[PDB]
């Protein structure tokens, strides 16, 4: 007797999204998941699945579903896929080479851009190594690019690791904001708590 409709509304229709560097994960459990409200929509321009068919999900049960949400610019949406490189894949959000799930993205220019520019969405520009799959780094220490310690002062080879996107309405589509939801489907030797409406 799994409990209530899965809160995909809270994820997809959140008034603000997370910065990609501090990407949000909602663990979805103990609920009936209506996936048809997603794949029957014309509002999602990217809905790329790997190993999972959306159509079968309404008749399938999982131990857990994971919804990762964040904002990136249009040109970077191709980096949210297995075996990709770039600032986002390397330093912000990394899918594993063997990622099984769906990447959902839509243009959010109407929500996340403002006249004068919205700069509240950040990404990590600098890191000493690439993220492991599904790793999250929200550290805000000065990036020491050289051999000399920074001692809390920015300067030569001493840079802040985070940078604003400049989301303005008049941006080219590549530089417009895109909201992203990565659905991971978990199946363990445990009771299934996330089932489609057809059980």
């Amino acid at each position, epitope marked *: 007797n799994i409990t209530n409709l899965c809160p995909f509304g809270e994820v997809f229709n959140a008034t603000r999204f997370a910065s990609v560097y501090a990407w949000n994960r909602k663990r979805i459990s103990n609920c009936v998941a209506d996936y048809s409200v997603l794949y029957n929509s014309a509002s999602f321009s990217t809905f790329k699945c790997y190993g999972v068919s959306p159509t079968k999900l309404n008749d399938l049960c999982f131990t857990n579903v994971y919804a990762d949400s964040f904002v990136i610019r249009g040109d970077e949406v191709r980096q949210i896929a297995p075996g990709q490189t770039g600032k986002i894949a390397d330093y912000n959000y990394k899918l594993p080479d063997d990622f099984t799930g769906c990447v959902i993205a839509w243009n959010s220019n109407n929500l996340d851009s403002k006249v004068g520019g919205n700069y509240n969405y*950040l990404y990590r520009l600098f890191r000493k190594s690439n993220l492991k799959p599904f790793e999250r780094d929200i550290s805000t220490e000065i990036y020491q690019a050289g051999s000399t310690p920074c001692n809390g002062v920015e300067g030569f080879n001493c840079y*802040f690791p985070l940078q604003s996107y400049g989301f303005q309405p008049t941006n080219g589509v590549g530089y417009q904001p895109y909201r992203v939801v990565v659905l991971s489907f978990e199946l363990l030797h445990a009771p299934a708590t996330v089932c489609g409406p057809k059980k």
Partner: nanobody
Amino acid sequence: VQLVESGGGLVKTGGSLRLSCAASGRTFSTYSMGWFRQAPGKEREFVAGMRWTGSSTFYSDSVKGRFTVSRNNAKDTVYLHMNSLKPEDTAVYYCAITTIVRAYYTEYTEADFGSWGQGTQVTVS
């Protein structure tokens, strides 16, 4: 948001002053702050700033090593400690915050900042 600014006054060359900038709650914990100065017939030039983290400060070429920015335990009050003051330092000093996160502080201009505090006069002779 209102930034409340105090400090300033007159001091001799080589003397010290402490400007104050206060903003309620999580303001300074959310938005990096900047100190600017304007001499009578000149542009509002960047002086010194602190990231929202409290763990990073940055300084114009002309004050680095003489001026230091610090923040209280509450994280609601930021101080500009002005030491080894020159006559060249004489100006109206302003504090402000930015939503614009530039990894390179060297790219910050007054155009990036808002919620300007009321100017406080600093005079060195």
